[PDB]
């Protein structure tokens, strides 16, 4: 079907191979190339050549312009492309959001000649481009400047509108090119945010087993084992990631990309996003509400899992579980018994170079106990968190 599929996308190729070997139906992956390595601009150029692009837009911001945009744009010009590094400017609080304002700012400075968009940056840039390109019916290329998240390959765009952050569903990148040396160069906080977002998968996978057994939610064995593999390697390499060695950031980014790839293949976020992510969503809402600057997704995710792993460990051994069926008792128990302690999570997060507790990034206890009680209400997901907050005897 595509040799570029089974050639310039060994990651996605092998993910699909796994799902197929466990006899599972999945949506075909619609990312044609995922390159992760040295250069990557070489292969980017090869791809735009192959697809006969010409008028290329590179959506960048203050920072990503500097550390990626100019390099890429100049090399594109030298090869004979109409390239341009278009900038997204900051809001009053020095933040670059996926708000309607930034969306429309991108969606006018891109002119009708333009036949391809390129997200040069991180999750937010990637959302604005993911959305904008979809509404202007153009392919967009993933150029990540940090291994901070698993939502580069995603179809959905968490954009802000009216007065809330909501996830419109759109279309995935046409390709992805990750410069391993640009990633190594990234702030340790961002690398550690990637590690954070991956540590969320300690509790997300379990909440997915709860979801599976209890609420009869879509579940994939092969998927669960894929994200297990990924999570396992990230941990193993916790030191390599800390120091930001080649192996370490390679393993981080490959694991995050595999997370987004399963999410894509299965058409929902359940294996990657559990109670820790829901809490994280609630905190984020509170930070917008307080009118104060946003903090890294992944940082919040690590800080959330560090607590919610203990919450679930306690639930699993609560006498309240005797009100419940033998089936639901043994489901919660068996799903959560293998959870490590909050302290171990925090220890990994520390070693990695990221924050363990929300006071470190300045959330505070107020919004923690607030989020912990209401987060379950954010999305129709049977989590440990819902089992708690919808049961007197566990409240
Ligand atoms: N499934 C999905 O669609 C997912 C969505 N997200 C999105 O991700 C956002 C947060 O992701 P973040 O990684 O925090 O992105 P971000 O762009 O919001 O924050 C990264 C910050 O670091 C800067 N930066 C990026 N690369 C850099 C580099 N190489 N060197 C120096 N500075 C650099 C950026 O300019 C920005 O100020 C959320 O707001 C959400 O919209 C997050 C995960 C998954
Ligand atoms: Ni996440």
Question: Which descriptors apply to this entry?
Answer:
NADP; 2 domains; 12% strand; binds nickel (II) ion; NAD; lipid biosynthesis; binds 1,4-dihydronicotinamide adenine dinucleotide; Rossmann fold; 8 strands; 6-stranded parallel sheet; alpha/beta; 395 residues; metal ion binding; Dehydroquinate synthase-like, alpha domain; two-stranded antiparallel ribbon; glycerol-1-phosphate dehydrogenase (NADP+) activity
Overview of this protein structure:
This is Glycerol-1-phosphate dehydrogenase [NAD(P)+]. The protein has 395 residues and is an alpha/beta fold. It has two domains: 175 residues, Rossmann fold (3-Layer(aba) Sandwich); 153 residues, Dehydroquinate synthase-like, alpha domain. 53% of the residues lie in helices and 12% in strands. The protein contains 17 helices and eight strands. Strands 1-8-5-4-2-3 form a six-stranded parallel β-sheet, with helices on both faces. Strands 6-7 form a two-stranded antiparallel ribbon. α7 packs across α11. The longest helix has 21 residues. The structure holds 1,4-dihydronicotinamide adenine dinucleotide and nickel (II) ion (NI).
Helices and strands in order, then pairings?
Elements: H1 10-21, E1 33-37, H2 41-50, E2 55-61, H3 62-78, E3 82-88, H4 100-109, E4 116-121, H5 123-135, E5 140-144, E6 156-161, E7 164-169, E8 175-179, H6 180-184, H7 188-199, H8 201-213, H9 221-236, H10 238-243, H11 246-266, H12 275-290, H13 297-315, H14 326-336, H15 342-352, H16 365-374, H17 384-389
Parallel strand pairs: 1-8, 2-3, 2-4, 4-5, 5-8
Antiparallel strand pairs: 6-7
The protein binds 1,4-dihydronicotinamide adenine dinucleotide and nickel (II) ion.
PDB class: biosynthetic protein
Keywords: Lipid synthesis, biosynthetic protein
Assembly: monomeric
């Amino acid at each position: 079907l595509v040799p570029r599929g089974s050639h310039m996308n060994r990651i996605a190729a092998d993910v699909q191979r796994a799902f197929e070997n466990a006899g599972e139906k999945t949506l075909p992956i619609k990312v044609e190339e995922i390159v992760l390595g040295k250069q990557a601009a070489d292969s980017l150029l090869d791809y735009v050549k192959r697809k006969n692009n010409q008028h290329i837009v590179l959506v960048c911001d203050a920072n990503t312009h500097r550390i990626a945009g100019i390099d890429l744009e100049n090399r594109l010009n030298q090869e004979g492309f109409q390239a341009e590094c278009l900038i997204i400017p900051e809001n009053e609080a020095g933040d670059v959001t996926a708000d309607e304002r930034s969306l429309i700012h991108v969606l006018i400075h891109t002119k009708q000649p333009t036949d391809v968009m390129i997200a040069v940056g991180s999750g937010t840039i990637h959302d604005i481009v993911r959305f904008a390109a979809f509404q202007r019916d153009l392919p967009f290329i993933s150029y990540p400047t940090a291994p901070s998240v698993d939502g580069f390959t995603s179809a959905g765009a968490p954009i802000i509108l009216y007065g809330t952050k909501t996830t419109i569903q759109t279309k995935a990148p046409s390709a992805l090119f990750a410069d391993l040396d640009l990633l190594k160069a990234a702030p340790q906080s961002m690398v550690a945010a990637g590690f954070g977002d991956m540590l969320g998968k300690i509790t997300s996978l379990a909440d997915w087993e709860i979801s599976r057994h209890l609420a009869g939610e879509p579940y994939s064995p092969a998927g669960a084992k894929i994200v297990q593999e990924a999570l396992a390697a990230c941990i193993e390499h916790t030191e390599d990631i800390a120091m930001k060695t080649e192996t370490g950031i390679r393993v981080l980014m490959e694991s995050l990309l595999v997370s987004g790839l399963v999410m894509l293949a299965l058409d929902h976020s359940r294996p990657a996003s559990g109670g820790e992510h829901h809490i994280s969503h609630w905190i984020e809402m509170e930070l917008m509400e307080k009118k104060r600057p946003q903090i890294l997704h992944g940082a919040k995710v690590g800080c959330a899992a560090v607590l919610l792993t203990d919450t679930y460990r306690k639930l699993a051994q609560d006498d309240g579980l005797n009100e419940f069926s033998p089936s639901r008792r043994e489901a919660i128990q068996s799903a959560y018994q293998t959870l490590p302690r909050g302290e171990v999570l925090a220890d990994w997060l520390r070693s990695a170079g990221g924050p363990a507790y929300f006071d470190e990034i300045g959330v505070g206890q107020d919004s923690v106990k607030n989020a912990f009680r209401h987060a379950h209400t954010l999305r129709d997901r049977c989590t440990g968190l819902r089992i708690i907050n919808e049961n007197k005897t566990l409240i």
